[PDB]
Ligand binder design. Structure first.
Ligand SMILES: [Mg+2]
Ligand SMILES: [Mg+2]
Ligand SMILES: [Mg+2]
Ligand SMILES: [Mg+2]
Ligand SMILES: [Mg+2]
Ligand SMILES: [Mg+2]
Ligand SMILES: [Mg+2]
Ligand SMILES: [Mg+2]
Ligand SMILES: [Mg+2]
Ligand SMILES: [Mg+2]
Ligand SMILES: [Mg+2]
Ligand SMILES: [Mg+2]
Ligand SMILES: [Mg+2]
Ligand SMILES: [Mg+2]
Ligand SMILES: [Mg+2]
Ligand SMILES: [Mg+2]
Ligand SMILES: [Mg+2]
Ligand SMILES: [Mg+2]
Ligand SMILES: [Mg+2]
Ligand SMILES: [Mg+2]
Ligand SMILES: [Mg+2]
Ligand SMILES: [Mg+2]
Ligand SMILES: [Mg+2]
Ligand SMILES: [Mg+2]
Ligand SMILES: [Mg+2]
Ligand SMILES: [Mg+2]
Ligand SMILES: [Mg+2]
Lengths: 245, 325, 100
RNA sequence: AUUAAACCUUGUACCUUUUGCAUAAUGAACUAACUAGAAAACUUCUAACUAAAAGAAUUACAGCUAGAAACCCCGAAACCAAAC
RNA sequence: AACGAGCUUGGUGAUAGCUGGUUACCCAAAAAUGAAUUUAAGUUCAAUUUUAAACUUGCUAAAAAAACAAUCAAAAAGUAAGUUUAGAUUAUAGCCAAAAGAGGACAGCUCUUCUGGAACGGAAAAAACCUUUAAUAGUGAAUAAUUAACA
RNA sequence: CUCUUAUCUUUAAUCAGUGAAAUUGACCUUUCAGUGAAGAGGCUGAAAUAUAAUAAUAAGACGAGAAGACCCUAUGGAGCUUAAAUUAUAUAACUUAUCUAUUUUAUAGUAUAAGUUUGAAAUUUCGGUUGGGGUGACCUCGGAGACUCCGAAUGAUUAUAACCUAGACUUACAAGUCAAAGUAAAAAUAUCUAUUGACCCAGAUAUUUUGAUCAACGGACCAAGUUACCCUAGGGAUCGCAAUCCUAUUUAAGAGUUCAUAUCGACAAUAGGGUUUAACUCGUUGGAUCAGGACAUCCCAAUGGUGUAGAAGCUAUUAAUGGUUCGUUUGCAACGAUUAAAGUCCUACGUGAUCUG
């Protein structure tokens, strides 16, 4: 253009409206985004994606399902660094869901539970803390680090009611109250509870990891040596006390 | 450089001091000193209550001594006591109105009589209206004032004191129109007319910087005040009915604004409109009010209330004129 | 401010459309046209605005209007300009929800 | 144009600049060399794979990855530190 | 060897809404109005303009009838544009003629509103008035304004 | 100086040697009238006109050089002044402490810290609109008139005025307007007139609310003068009405008038000049030298008329031919003596690359 400020290359900053109070500064501050960096994120999983994954052989329904086997089959993508705390099952696709599977997901829903239970499956909810989740999504590198497997901390006070509640199928919930809660849900959605015990794969379905276990078959405090193909367990009494806790 | 108050004091020293001479010292300090306020009763339901309460305060109605329909309680001679702030009555009407005792003389002088129609040109919230309303037992009235905001509060004052039923009656009429133009509107309409022309307000001018006539910008208005006063006084003379009585009131001590204006106006009416005015003497009225008011007899016409240290109720210059034809 | 007739004759008018804004009662409300406190006129039903002049009969209660009407001579009849909105839609239709 | 270099006909230097006008006002004696537009948030275009893309951490209710595509020069009066 | 406060180096490529400058061809489209601002030698937004994409009515005109030569606008017709979405600036001082108000229910003068123009042809003068749809070669041609007036 | 001259040196000019500077778009570089921006070697219309040098003049080339002058602008500076704003272990002081002496609490001091009081200083600033200046002022909102006027940062009345939610007005943004339905209190709109202030940040309470003559009113949390001692970056220039009063011409209501004997003039009309009637200081040029032109003629010359006897005049026309003084007071205005007359004007004070106040 002609000679002037914008042509000299020295025009003001963005949001500067000539000298009147700018639009972005003259609006009241509100807490839309307050505490955003500490809010919990659960990468949702729908039942269409679950059934679709099972159909194509990218999830093994016969084996127990967990966050590791969802990530391994690329069914879900998880970013621990971005406050992801796990996967929440979602009600979308319940009607098409006709699969019996033992799925562990940090958050569950009423209707999502119905789809799993009606077809004769086990649904459980377990809390993984930020350190535990990173190892669960990405196991191999942790074994390469050489550090011992860590314990899994219990949920903080805010989440304690949820994971101790029978209706939510919490891992810490009382085993005795499960039957009644399942039956009430069964009546609500108009299906008859199937007898899992009679089912041949009762042991697999019923399988549940210890509340202090990140992986079903590995106890806290062990060390995995991939190069030698061995597992090392501490013999020290002091360390065993700490890990057993 | 000079404040309006400084200029106002300068004018009195060069002019007013000469007129009064040896009396000027006491008057000069009187104006600088705080003014004395006299409480005026609202009558109505609080008619008895205020009178009993004011007696407890030791204030005495100067009007009552004069008699021995307006009673205004005032403190004793040389008493500096301050009246308590006005308070609302049980009915919702203010118990009393604080005002300068001298300001009530023009109303008492106008000889209000029952079954009369009264005009109050440029009345403003000077208090004479409210006082006159209390006198207006059976008297239709009328109010006028050039400004609006000045007139706006005047209605508020009427709301506080005057009961709604009385105000609702046509008797109470509020308008804001030019006084000189008003003369043509209603000629020979009001038996009694009280005309309080805008004056230099010497007491207010010295104390108050706001809206002071002595400001340099307002030079034009100050010089033309005598001409405007004559026209307004002439307008009232036109409006008053045959045989009517009119009172012309000026706050200022100026000889030019007080005596020449009234006599000059009488001459103007006699020449242009061929009308005659009968002068009236209030010397007897002065004698009754000597205790509560002090006057000086130098003025050929009018009864000016000089502010005195013992009785600081001035300044009020009021002259009563009766329309002969 | 910017007082005028927003909706001219023949214009489709939705429920809440404001026909016009007036400082004083230049246009009086008509059928299916509500009157706002600020004296603006708003439609009430979908329709086509049509302006007509009709005899104005004031409510008995207000004194000023009644006195003025009486002051008029017997022969004379006053008129005012009104804004009307003729409904252009059927309020409802009947459909068979189910056969039982 | 012309047979003919000049005569005859036509024609108010250049840039910047003022309003979109100069007979103005700035700048240039001439030659050689040197002497001033630079960044990828959003968009467009082109491909790879595709509910997935990316050679670790990223984004996704057709996306994702890579490529190409962009924003000058000269000049104060001054201010501070430390030497002289 | 020019002290309202020495000089040298460094900070330092100080900063400059200001002045000056900013290097090949070709084709195409293309405007100094409103608002705020320590603002009126600036910037930001609206409006305008532009490149692409989406799909459908748009411009002139627009009878009756309103609200009073306009604000609005239906069938038509002459004709090809208009709306929405994504990206992006510069611009924000006009110049002159001719119309109409409005300032002292004046002319003028200062404003405001509408219209037009930016020759190589014409009008002693000649960017602004009048004739003139772009630009190309030809030793073709018909023409416009005008080339004063003979009262 | 009237009034200038003569001789000599220097410089100049010529022959010989040596060899700068500012400046320079290109130039084959004319006159007059016209046009134009106080403007023309170059454009328009006439005219003039072989080519080059040497030496002179300074009219033009808005001639060339300088850190000179002038008015205005910059959210550019710097010096000074403080009644500007913010600070201020310069100093001095005192107070409580720390701390060492001492006496039973006490008065002493103080390698320190925390305050209070002065301020030697440091830092930073100079809002906008008013044809310049001091004084007035005005800066936002709305009502009325077509810029002239009125108001406001609302008060009174209020048996107290919910929530939620279609569609719209207005509008750069921000702000500001109206509202069906649904739902809820109660037994539907508070009442006029009209009324503004963002974000940040501080206050309040048991979850709801309050903070601006921020009035320069889109609002910097908080900053005045002054410069002729100045500086830089640039831009500039170099008509109306009225109200009386005077007058002039035409009116003349009137009176008038009286042997080289008369008119004036009410009232009007019309041209001028004042006054009242509407905020509180001012903006190149004499002289010397040489002059060019205009005529609206001052003198010379040629004439008409005359209330022109002769002699002085007065009025008028034609004519631009040559001429058109010397001083004193000295800031131009007077004056004194003369002359046939001591013209009026234009030529950017006509003319400072000719000189000067
Ligand atoms: Mg501001
Ligand atoms: Mg993710
Ligand atoms: Mg040059
Ligand atoms: Mg620079
Ligand atoms: Mg415009
Ligand atoms: Mg500015
Ligand atoms: Mg600027
Ligand atoms: Mg020579
Ligand atoms: Mg030689
Ligand atoms: Mg030659
Ligand atoms: Mg030649
Ligand atoms: Mg020439
Ligand atoms: Mg010429
Ligand atoms: Mg020529
Ligand atoms: Mg010359
Ligand atoms: Mg500074
Ligand atoms: Mg908004
Ligand atoms: Mg409703
Ligand atoms: Mg401001
Ligand atoms: Mg402002
Ligand atoms: Mg505004
Ligand atoms: Mg000096
Ligand atoms: Mg000095
Ligand atoms: Mg001559
Ligand atoms: Mg002649
Ligand atoms: Mg002399
Ligand atoms: Mg010269």
């Amino acid at each position: 253009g002609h000679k002037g400020e914008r042509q000299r290359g020295t025009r003001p900053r963005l949001g500067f409206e000539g000298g009147q109070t700018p639009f972005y500064i003259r609006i009241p501050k509100y807490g839309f985004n307050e505490g955003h960096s500490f809010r919990h994120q659960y990468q949702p999983l729908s039942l269409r994606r679950l059934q679709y994954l099972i159909d194509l052989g990218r999830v093994d329904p016969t084996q127990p399902i967990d966050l590791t086997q969802l990530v391994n089959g690329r069914g879900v993508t998880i970013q621990p660094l971005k406050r992801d705390y796990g996967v929440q099952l979602v009600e979308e696709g319940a009607d098409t869901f006709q699969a019996k599977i033992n799925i562990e997901v940090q958050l569950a829903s009423e209707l999502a539970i119905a789809a799993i239970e009606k077809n004769g499956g086990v649904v459980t909810t377990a809390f993984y803390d930020p350190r535990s989740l990173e190892i669960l999504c990405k196991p191999i590198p942790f074994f390469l680090r050489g550090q011992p497997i860590p314990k899994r901390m219990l949920p903080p006070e805010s989440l304690v009611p949820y994971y101790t509640d029978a209706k939510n199928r919490g891992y810490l919930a009382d085993p005795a109250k499960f039957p009644e809660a399942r039956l009430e849900l069964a009546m609500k959605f108009g299906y008859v509870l199937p007898d899992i015990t009679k089912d041949e794969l009762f042991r697999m379905l019923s399988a549940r990891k210890d509340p202090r276990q990140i992986f079903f078959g590995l106890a806290p405090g062990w060390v995995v040596n991939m190069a030698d193909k061995k597992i090392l367990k501490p013999t020290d009494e002091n360390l065993l006390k700490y890990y057993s806790s | 450089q000079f404040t309006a108050s400084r200029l106002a004091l300068q004018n009195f020293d060069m002019t007013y001091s000469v007129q009064f001479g040896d009396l000027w010292p006491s008057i000069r300090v009187s104006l600088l000193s705080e003014q004395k306020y006299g409480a005026l009763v609202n009558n109505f339901a609080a008619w008895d209550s205020v009178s009993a309460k004011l007696e407890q305060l030791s204030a005495k109605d100067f009007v009552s001594e004069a008699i021995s329909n307006l009673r205004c309680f005032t403190f004793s001679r040389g008493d500096v006591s301050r009246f308590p702030p006005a308070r609302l009555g049980s009915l919702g009407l203010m118990d009393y109105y604080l005002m300068d005792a001298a300001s009530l003389l023009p109303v008492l002088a106008l000889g209000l009589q029952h079954g009369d129609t009264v005009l109050d040109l440029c009345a403003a919230p000077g208090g004479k209206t409210l006082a006159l309303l209390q006198t207006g037992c059976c008297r239709n009235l009328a109010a006028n004032d050039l400004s609006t905001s000045r007139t706006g509060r005047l209605q508020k004052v009427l709301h506080s004191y005057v009961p709604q039923d009385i105000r609702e009656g046509n008797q109470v009429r509020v308008t804001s129109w030019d006084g000189r133009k008003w003369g043509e509107l209603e000629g020979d309409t009001y038996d009694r007319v009280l005309v309080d022309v805008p004056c230099t307000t010497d007491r207010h001018s010295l104390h108050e910087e706001e809206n002071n006539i002595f400001q340099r910008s307002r030079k034009k208005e100050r010089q033309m005040l005598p001409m405007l006063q004559v026209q307004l006084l002439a307008a009232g003379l036109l409006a008053t009915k045959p045989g009517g009585h009119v009172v012309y009131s000026t706050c200022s001590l100026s000889h030019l604004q007080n005596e020449y204006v009234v006599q000059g106006a009488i001459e103007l009416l006699a020449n242009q409109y061929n009308i005659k005015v009968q002068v009236e003497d209030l010397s007897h009225f002065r004698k009754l009010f000597m205790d509560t008011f002090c006057f000086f007899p130098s003025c050929q016409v009018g009864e000016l209330v000089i502010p005195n240290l013992m009785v600081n109720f001035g300044p009020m210059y009021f002259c009563k004129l009766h329309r002969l034809p | 401010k910017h007082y005028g007739i927003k909706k001219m004759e023949g214009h489709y008018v939705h429920a809440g459309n404001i026909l016009g804004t007036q400082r004083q009662f230049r246009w009086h409300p008509g059928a299916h046209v509500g009157l706002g406190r600020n004296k603006c006129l708003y439609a009430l039903e979908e329709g086509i605005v049509r302006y007509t002049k009709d005899v104005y009969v004031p409510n008995p209660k207000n004194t000023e209007a009644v006195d003025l009407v009486t002051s008029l001579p017997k022969g004379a009849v006053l008129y005012k300009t009104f804004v009307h909105v003729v409904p252009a839609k059927p309020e409802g239709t009947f459909k068979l929800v189910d056969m039982l």
